[PDB]
Amino acid sequence: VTEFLKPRLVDIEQVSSTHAKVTLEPLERGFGHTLGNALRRILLSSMPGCA
Amino acid sequence: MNKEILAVVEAVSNEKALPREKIFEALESALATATKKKYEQEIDVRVQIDRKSGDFDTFRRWLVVDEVTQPTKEITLEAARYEDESLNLGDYVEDQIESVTFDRITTQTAKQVIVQKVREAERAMVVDQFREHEGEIITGVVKKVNRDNISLDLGNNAEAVILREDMLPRENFRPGDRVRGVLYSVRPEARGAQLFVTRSKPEMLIELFRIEVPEIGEEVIEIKAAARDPGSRAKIAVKTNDKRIDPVGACVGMRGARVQAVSTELGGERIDIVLWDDNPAQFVINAMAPADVASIVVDEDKHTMDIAVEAGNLAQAIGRNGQNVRLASQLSGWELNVMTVDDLQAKHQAEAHAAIDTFTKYLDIDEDFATVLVEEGFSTLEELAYVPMKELLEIEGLDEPTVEALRERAKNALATIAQAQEESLGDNKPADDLLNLEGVDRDLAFKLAARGVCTLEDLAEQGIDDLADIEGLTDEKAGALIMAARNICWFG
Amino acid sequence: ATILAEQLEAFVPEFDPILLRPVDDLELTVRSANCLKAEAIHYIGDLVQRTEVELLKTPNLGKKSLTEIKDVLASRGLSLGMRLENWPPASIADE
Amino acid sequence: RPIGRLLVDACYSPVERIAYNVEAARVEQRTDLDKLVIEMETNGTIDPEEAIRRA
């Protein structure tokens, strides 16, 4: 009952340079949005750095 | 109804030459199987057909067994004997069961089982009667051409197969073409093609000659050997016991007509016909045709023959891609080395010089005496060590003391050579001395001996650092082996 | 993913007990059960020690009832003629 | 398999309404911190700390 479809990055089609395109499958009928939204909001701000 | 069973049994018995009993046993098994399929449970079922009426009774069979594994189909001997005391292990207990109505379903099952029984009776007896065909050149019609095989129809529901390796390299068959080939193997694939037919193997050539040459079919001429490069060239060796018959002339026929008929059936394959000789050297000369042989040297120990030819005939003796020498070697069973007369003399001079150098080095004799041994036919240290003393005493200038000394030197030379190689690698000396330390495999013993560690003492004298570069030897395993060697050498 | 995972680490020898059962628990036909009771076979461990040849001597036990007993014992992984050392256990000798 | 069974649909789901309301934090002297207050709505079959732990 706690067994889901554990996913994986099937490919990293890094298009050209300083640009990647990472596809992850398979997730549940609803987990693509929650992982996309979680990673999108964290990368946007939380991720530190210098400028 | 009743009389119709008898009329069917009589019609099938007469048409398929099959025992009526075998047809009934099979119909009983067919009806039992059809009955089993109407029940949701796996039951055992016996059917019995009355041989006069054609009426049939169906049972719930109970295979009388010692230990019951399937209670639905098996009964213990003790329980079976409670119903009928006459029953034994392997008999069937019955149970009044409604016989399946003979619908077109049972009818179709009965038809299939009859057809299968005919394949294992009528068709089996036809194959037994055609014992000649099973081995001779059967004729079939091409039913299907696949990439890897050709299916032939032989008639009477018999199917044969020619495999891709069993075809000639340039043959192209179409569905409906007639093809001849030798039945070289009968297996047990009744459903499909149990018969294997060849056109490429030497048996196809032999049987074509048997059909085309009456003198071979009458056993007046015998084919002793056949060597074949399929669709290109073959050689056959022929013998006769009748001195009035030329066996080569008989196989060629008037103006080559017989050999050309065989060649045409084989897609234009060139056939050489040679006289079999009981002398191997004379037989190889005949097998080398059309090349003229100048001399033959026979090495009986290596089962090889060196064939000298004139420099103009060398290319003919070898043939295109070595085809002539290869077919001659396959026909004779000998390995055949084709060279020029000049090359054979140079080879013999090099072998004589190598034998002289070997004898001078190992026997402590002069070059003049080594030359005499080679001229008398001695080429190896083994010959000198083991040949009968009488043959060595026939050599001019050898006395019994000198022959004994020569044999002792040859044996000591053979012993020394063996010991030296066994210590250099891991054959015997290092495979016992260096391998005494528990843990030493033969490979490790040879790796140690390649470093000059030939004995168990040499290993006891090593450090771990001296052995650290040996592939597969860890410092711990090196330390254990050195300590095992020291325990035996210094504390044994 | 490392940041989001670090923000969640504060959250995340008489056979066995079957031999001790009565023969009535084998769901045998009323005939087979009454034939076994007439021979003082009360437990599955008593039944498993009897041979097929001994059961066929029992009054009114037919070949059909013997096949039923085998099929039922086989469904439980038991066979007729197993020797149990120390059967019956002293816990049963007082009923 | 028999004709006497009756199959109902199966809504294996204990919760009904999950509402979070983020709000400012003052317990810690440090400002720009947040509190996450989740009001769930269970039907009684699931403990709330067990629900947040499984999530």
Side-chain angles (χ1 to χ4, degrees), chain A, chain B residues 7 11 17 19 26 30 32 34 54 71 79-80 90 110 121 124 135 140 155 158 160 169 175-176 181 188 190 192-193 202 214 217 225-227 230-231 234 237 247 249-250 253 256-257 261 267-268 280-281 287 289-291 294 308 311-312 315 317 319 322 328 333 346 350 352 354-355 370 377 385 388 397 401 405 410 413 415 418 420 426 430-431 439 445 449-450 452 460 463 468 472 478-480 484-485 492, chain C residues 1-13 17 22 33 38 40 45 59 62 74 77 81 88-90 93, chain D residues 1-25 28 30-55:
Chain A
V1 69
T2 57
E3 277 70 58
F4 291 85
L5 269 127
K6 269 137 289 294
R8 84 257 164 96
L9 349 105
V10 64
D11 55 351
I12 303 170
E13 200 267 293
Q14 6 89 60
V15 31
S16 299
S17 196
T18 357
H19 198 142
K21 182 177 179 180
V22 178
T23 95
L24 252 123
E25 49 92 54
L27 304 139
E28 266 52 55
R29 202 225 20 180
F31 287 179
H33 290 286
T34 186
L35 293 185
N37 195 8
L39 270 67
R40 190 185 75 189
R41 288 185 60 86
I42 275 137
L43 277 166
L44 232 27
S45 289
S46 322
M47 276 287 284
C50 299
Chain C
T2 301
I3 289 171
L4 188 55
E6 290 291 330
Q7 286 293 104
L8 290 180
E9 289 292 328
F11 289 160
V12 305
Chain D
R1 177 66 65 192
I3 66 171
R5 293 290 178 184
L6 281 71
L7 273 75
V8 302
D9 290 329
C11 183
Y12 311 111
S13 182
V15 299
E16 182 75 27
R17 184 179 67 86
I18 313 297
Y20 61 95
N21 288 320
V22 296
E23 64 187 4
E28 298 91 14
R30 184 172 177 84
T31 60
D32 200 2
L33 269 62
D34 294 333
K35 183 189 287 186
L36 178 62
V37 173
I38 296 172
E39 180 175 1
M40 63 183 68
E41 184 78 27
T42 318
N43 62 358
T45 62
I46 283 299
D47 290 329
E49 189 180 2
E50 185 68 28
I52 201 72
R53 187 174 298 274
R54 286 177 181 172

